[PDB]
Design a protein around this ligand. Sequence first.
Ligand SMILES: *[C@@H]1O[C@H](CO[C@@H]2O[C@@H](C)[C@@H](O)[C@@H](O)[C@@H]2O)[C@@H](O[C@@H]2O[C@H](CO)[C@@H](O[C@@H]3O[C@H](CO[C@H]4O[C@H](CO)[C@@H](O)[C@H](O)[C@@H]4O[C@@H]4O[C@H](CO)[C@@H](O[C@@H]5O[C@H](CO)[C@H](O)[C@H](O)[C@H]5O)[C@H](O)[C@H]4NC(C)=O)[C@@H](O)[C@H](O[C@H]4O[C@H](CO)[C@@H](O)[C@H](O)[C@@H]4O[C@@H]4O[C@H](CO)[C@@H](O)[C@H](O)[C@H]4NC(C)=O)[C@@H]3O)[C@H](O)[C@H]2NC(C)=O)[C@H](O)[C@H]1NC(C)=O
Ligand SMILES: *[C@@H]1O[C@H](CO[C@@H]2O[C@@H](C)[C@@H](O)[C@@H](O)[C@@H]2O)[C@@H](O[C@@H]2O[C@H](CO)[C@@H](O[C@@H]3O[C@H](CO[C@H]4O[C@H](CO)[C@@H](O)[C@H](O)[C@@H]4O[C@@H]4O[C@H](CO)[C@@H](O[C@@H]5O[C@H](CO)[C@H](O)[C@H](O)[C@H]5O)[C@H](O)[C@H]4NC(C)=O)[C@@H](O)[C@H](O[C@H]4O[C@H](CO)[C@@H](O)[C@H](O)[C@@H]4O[C@@H]4O[C@H](CO)[C@@H](O)[C@H](O)[C@H]4NC(C)=O)[C@@H]3O)[C@H](O)[C@H]2NC(C)=O)[C@H](O)[C@H]1NC(C)=O
Ligand SMILES: *[C@@H]1O[C@H](CO)[C@@H](O[C@@H]2O[C@H](CO)[C@@H](O[C@@H]3O[C@H](CO)[C@@H](O)[C@H](O[C@H]4O[C@H](CO)[C@@H](O)[C@H](O)[C@@H]4O[C@H]4O[C@H](CO)[C@@H](O)[C@H](O)[C@@H]4O[C@H]4O[C@H](CO)[C@@H](O)[C@H](O)[C@@H]4O)[C@@H]3O)[C@H](O)[C@H]2NC(C)=O)[C@H](O)[C@H]1NC(C)=O
Ligand SMILES: *[C@@H]1O[C@H](CO)[C@@H](O[C@@H]2O[C@H](CO)[C@@H](O)[C@H](O)[C@H]2NC(C)=O)[C@H](O)[C@H]1NC(C)=O
Ligand SMILES: [Zn+2]
Ligand SMILES: [Zn+2]
Ligand SMILES: [Zn+2]
Ligand SMILES: [Zn+2]
Ligand SMILES: [Zn+2]
Ligand SMILES: [Zn+2]
Lengths: 215, 209, 259
Amino acid sequence: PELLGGPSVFLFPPKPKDTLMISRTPEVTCVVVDVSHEDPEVKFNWYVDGVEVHNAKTKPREEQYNSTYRVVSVLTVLHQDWLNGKEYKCKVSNKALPAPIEKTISKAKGQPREPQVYTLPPSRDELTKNQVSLTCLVKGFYPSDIAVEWESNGQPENNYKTTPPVLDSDGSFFLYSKLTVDKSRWQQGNVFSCSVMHEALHNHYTQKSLSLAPG
Amino acid sequence: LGGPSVFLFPPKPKDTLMISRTPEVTCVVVDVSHEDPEVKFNWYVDGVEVHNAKTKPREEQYNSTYRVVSVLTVLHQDWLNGKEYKCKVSNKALPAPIEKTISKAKGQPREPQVYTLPPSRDELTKNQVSLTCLVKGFYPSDIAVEWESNGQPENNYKTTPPVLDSDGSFFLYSKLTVDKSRWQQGNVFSCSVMHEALHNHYTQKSLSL
Amino acid sequence: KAVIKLQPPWVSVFQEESVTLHCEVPGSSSTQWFLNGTAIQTSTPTYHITSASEDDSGEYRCQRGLSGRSDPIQLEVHRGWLLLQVSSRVLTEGEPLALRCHAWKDKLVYNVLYYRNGKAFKFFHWNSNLTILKTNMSHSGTYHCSGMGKHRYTSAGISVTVKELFPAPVLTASVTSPLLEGTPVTLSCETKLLLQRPGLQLYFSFYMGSKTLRGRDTSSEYQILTARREDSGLYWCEAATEDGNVLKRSPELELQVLG
Ligand SMILES: *[C@@H]1O[C@H](CO[C@@H]2O[C@@H](C)[C@@H](O)[C@@H](O)[C@@H]2O)[C@@H](O[C@@H]2O[C@H](CO)[C@@H](O[C@@H]3O[C@H](CO[C@H]4O[C@H](CO)[C@@H](O)[C@H](O)[C@@H]4O[C@@H]4O[C@H](CO)[C@@H](O[C@@H]5O[C@H](CO)[C@H](O)[C@H](O)[C@H]5O)[C@H](O)[C@H]4NC(C)=O)[C@@H](O)[C@H](O[C@H]4O[C@H](CO)[C@@H](O)[C@H](O)[C@@H]4O[C@@H]4O[C@H](CO)[C@@H](O)[C@H](O)[C@H]4NC(C)=O)[C@@H]3O)[C@H](O)[C@H]2NC(C)=O)[C@H](O)[C@H]1NC(C)=O
Ligand SMILES: *[C@@H]1O[C@H](CO[C@@H]2O[C@@H](C)[C@@H](O)[C@@H](O)[C@@H]2O)[C@@H](O[C@@H]2O[C@H](CO)[C@@H](O[C@@H]3O[C@H](CO[C@H]4O[C@H](CO)[C@@H](O)[C@H](O)[C@@H]4O[C@@H]4O[C@H](CO)[C@@H](O[C@@H]5O[C@H](CO)[C@H](O)[C@H](O)[C@H]5O)[C@H](O)[C@H]4NC(C)=O)[C@@H](O)[C@H](O[C@H]4O[C@H](CO)[C@@H](O)[C@H](O)[C@@H]4O[C@@H]4O[C@H](CO)[C@@H](O)[C@H](O)[C@H]4NC(C)=O)[C@@H]3O)[C@H](O)[C@H]2NC(C)=O)[C@H](O)[C@H]1NC(C)=O
Ligand SMILES: *[C@@H]1O[C@H](CO)[C@@H](O[C@@H]2O[C@H](CO)[C@@H](O[C@@H]3O[C@H](CO)[C@@H](O)[C@H](O[C@H]4O[C@H](CO)[C@@H](O)[C@H](O)[C@@H]4O[C@H]4O[C@H](CO)[C@@H](O)[C@H](O)[C@@H]4O[C@H]4O[C@H](CO)[C@@H](O)[C@H](O)[C@@H]4O)[C@@H]3O)[C@H](O)[C@H]2NC(C)=O)[C@H](O)[C@H]1NC(C)=O
Ligand SMILES: *[C@@H]1O[C@H](CO)[C@@H](O[C@@H]2O[C@H](CO)[C@@H](O)[C@H](O)[C@H]2NC(C)=O)[C@H](O)[C@H]1NC(C)=O
Ligand SMILES: [Zn+2]
Ligand SMILES: [Zn+2]
Ligand SMILES: [Zn+2]
Ligand SMILES: [Zn+2]
Ligand SMILES: [Zn+2]
Ligand SMILES: [Zn+2]
């Protein structure tokens, strides 16, 4: 007398940065968990607005810590298609299911709203430390899909962390990104840049600079 | 396997960090049947039984099951010193009693640094501006943040979740939105932060033009 | 006309399950089966579906020997995790209804919920069926269930209709109260059949206070030939089917007789 149950399916969108730059390759990922030794064969079919496509790749399966298998199929999507709201369906067939599971994903719906991007210098109080925080406030944006980076002198600055998007009171999203730098790099007048990728920006990109004033 | 399920919830951070408040742990039992007899609770603090929990009558839920809640008050210093709180639930529908344990997040506390940041000059073109509170370097992640001005709470703000920083501490930001005219008239705003590792578990930082 | 019995009695079954339909009435082993208004190439009084498929879904009727054609049963064959099986889709008030939250491959689910029109009305720690021994119109609705296995699974909805046979009666009197001593009065137990039931008669009985005035009889009238003061009281009646499966009472009427 065995508990009723079979595999489960999770379907994931591309990464925002991959969607926003035509040079990258965005993918949707269909993940099947709890595949047993008893019914191990999994079949994927994929559809884009209802039309079957044949270019997905299945990854070699992986036995998980709990002696079930995780099986993953990845489908490359076209830049324009994902951004223009096409719907991507993964159908998963397996003998432990009473019928195939179908999951559909697309870009978030709703009118896109342009990020406003503000750079904020360190608080005067923080200038007593050895490292200072440079802040990038990105607000007013929709949908919540966004990428934020920092750079200085044309090189990526990687000592930053960015908050998740947070839903604001008017339906849009905001976040903050914090770049930590050595105080002397600030005090010497180095220019830092916060760059934002979002679909409601012109060319999907903008950047704002932050530096200690001269003189 | 068919019985009730148990969830044990901590106090709210703000209640643990203000000595005038009454922090509580809450043991919640769901999927109680109309036909199940009394759901019984035993409570332990560091393994020692206590008798001052308040257990409510069962409450019918919209899905026709019943929900029972028991609440145990926790003492301010006990919680902060890391005492462990165990709820043990017994009932005919459970072949063995279910025990859950909860305590404050463990590990060495570190107090937040709190900095207020004025609106960017570029935002001054708008009708509303953003006042920011950066709260960084704190451990554990339990924290509370609010804003005031002239003795009144300011309610038009949102605060990020804590984010794990690269040194294993947490940070967050809080954003208070105000009409630009209020900022430009020199009104004073305050970001108030409660965290265990602060002196008396709180600090306040002001911000004004 | 004949009557189809299902074994097991569920009108909704999973792909690959079995069910046996029984054509019942003495006598002749030459049965005609109809699926969707159309005869089938076997003719025992038992039709066995060994492994159900989409080809077994539809309307079944049966004729045996010399009897009429059964009323039809709708068998549906489904795929899914959980199936809310019912013993009938369309019933008359008084008849029993069984419901079952059935798991695919007879697997185990626990903490089972039964729903009607989207509202859960019964919870069982162990998967149990539900029987409503005596339905009425208010049991009409769309039923489903949910239960916990490895995850929580939910059945699709199934519609059940229970038809009212006759409204509760109203006791009336042929004269307005108060009436004079000596006046004749006829009491009437008023209701009406809501369904065509060709040979069906209701049976009526009349009460004064808790006292029986006249027991079960096909007459829906009761005559007080010459009213007396002592007839002042509360009057009511019951209306029943022949077999008492549906039995309903009236409210009480105040009748006063003056001296
Ligand atoms: C047996 O074990 C396995 C493995 O165990 C797990 O891993 C091991 C190592 C241990 O750590 C163990 O403790 C772990 O448990 C178990 O497998 C897990 O099963 C659970 C469910 O039981 C799955 O839970 C869902 O997780 C979702 C999020 O998954 C991501 O994030 C987690 C970390 O948080 C990662 O571990 C996952 O791997 C997922 O990570 C994402 O993966 C994507 C695909 O690879 C990545 O995107 C791709 O990235 C590549 C490059 O890397 C390219 O960029 C591609 O382009 C891109 O497509 C992605 O970056 C990566 N993200 C991160 C952060 O890493 C949750 O979303 C999901 O929640 C949904 O469903 C819940 C139901 O369980 C429900 O409660 C939720 O509400 C939510 O439901 C959705 O909710 C949203 C909004 O709330 C709604 O909008 C939706 O409509 C609604 N949908 C649904 C369907 O309800 C689940 O929590 C878990 O992912 C899975 N883990 C793994 C690794 O596969 C298994 O359960 C065990 N079995 C038993 C019996 O124990
Ligand atoms: C019949 O219905 C009942 C009632 O349902 C409710 O009403 C209907 C209409 C629906 O709306 C329904 O969604 C409602 O929830 C059903 O009951 C529910 O049953 C489910 C499980 O089946 C319970 O699920 C758990 O939820 C936990 C979180 O609960 C909180 O948040 C939700 C909102 O998201 C609220 O709905 C809950 O009420 C809980 O809310 C918290 O309540 C606390 C106690 O009151 C509050 O704290 C107190 O607050 C007061 C102030 O009022 C003071 O401050 C006190 O001091 C303080 O103590 C708190 O503020 C409040 N928060 C919020 C945000 O409101 C999840 O934690 C839990 O997840 C764990 O377990 C899962 C297994 O189920 C597992 O998958 C998860 O991953 C997770 O597992 C944990 O993993 C984490 C790591 O991430 C670890 O920390 C843990 O160790 C690990 N543990 C375990 C055991 O796994 C569950 O999802 C649900 O809570 C419960 N609702 C109610 C109201 O009780 C019932 O299921 C139905 N039955 C059927 C058959 O359908
Ligand atoms: C289909 O079948 C289902 C079951 O399969 C039927 O559902 C059942 O319906 C029953 C009949 O109404 C219902 O019974 C009620 O249960 C409640 C609470 O659980 C109970 O309080 C009710 O008790 C009163 O009624 C009964 C007679 O029906 C009396 O014997 C009793 O003494 C109570 O009387 C009072 O309320 C009446 C009005 O309802 C008055 O006439 C009577 O004089 C008395 O009045 C006073 O006291 C009142 C407070 O009690 C007060 O407010 C008032 O001012 C007076 O002082 C009753 O037994 C079942 O609970 C229900 N079962 C389920 C599972 O739902 C369903 O009806 C069927 N549907 C159809 C369409 O036929
Ligand atoms: C008997 O007739 C019914 C009704 O036409 C058939 O059921 C339909 O057929 C398929 C499923 O098999 C579905 O596309 C429809 O939704 C059903 N219609 C309705 C109104 O429910 C059934 O297949 C027929 N049975 C046989 C054996 O031919
Ligand atoms: Zn294995
Ligand atoms: Zn483009
Ligand atoms: Zn664009
Ligand atoms: Zn301090
Ligand atoms: Zn203290
Ligand atoms: Zn689950």
